[PDB]
Amino acid sequence: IVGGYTCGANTVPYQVSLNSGYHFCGGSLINSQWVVSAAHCYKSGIQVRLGEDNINVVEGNEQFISASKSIVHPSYNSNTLNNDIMLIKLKSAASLNSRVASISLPTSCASAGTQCLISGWGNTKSSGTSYPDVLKCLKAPILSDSSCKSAYPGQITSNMFCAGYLEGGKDSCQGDSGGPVVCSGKLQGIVSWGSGCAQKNKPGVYTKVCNYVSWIKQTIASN
């Protein structure tokens, strides 16, 4: 997260870190057994780390749970990044408490201008590389269809949306992929892609979770 702020320990209790001997992506807890992340974050050997603040220190409140299923959307296209969503099933149910909690799925799509909270342990610099120990947060608005397509012509599908700031300086970045965009208590977005981070006229692009609620429910119910 570039241009954001320190969230504070466990203030984003649905935020998880995906770990393979290092943090490589985020995710969002949607019930005691299931995490939503990005399809492009798929790999073998994922350990889900819940209740994290400082990802490099055992502070208390952590739960480390192996992924038992990692389900990439069958129509994920690795070239266009359309359908960039993955469900992870935890080997055992997380213990839910104030510091580890699920986030609600949307009942409808959000509109342009709606403030959202984007969080993660990604790069904090738009030029070069600095990775934080603690969770970073950013408040960012959803952009209109017209500004999103203007920014990225021929690239925005119906399953994507833009959020952030066209003036530059504030964005998600490398290491934030898979993490939450939460708007009025609903998981509307998954950190997916963009041209660089926090660049002028190049906002972040996010998987449009409201298009996948039915698929998520159907997939969980059958697994």
């Binding site: 992506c25 990005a38 990044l81 990604g122 950190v191 892609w193």
Partner: peptide, 11 residues
Amino acid sequence: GRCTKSIXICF
């Protein structure tokens, strides 16, 4: 260029 925001994919 467009890239995913994972550690450590660009197009």
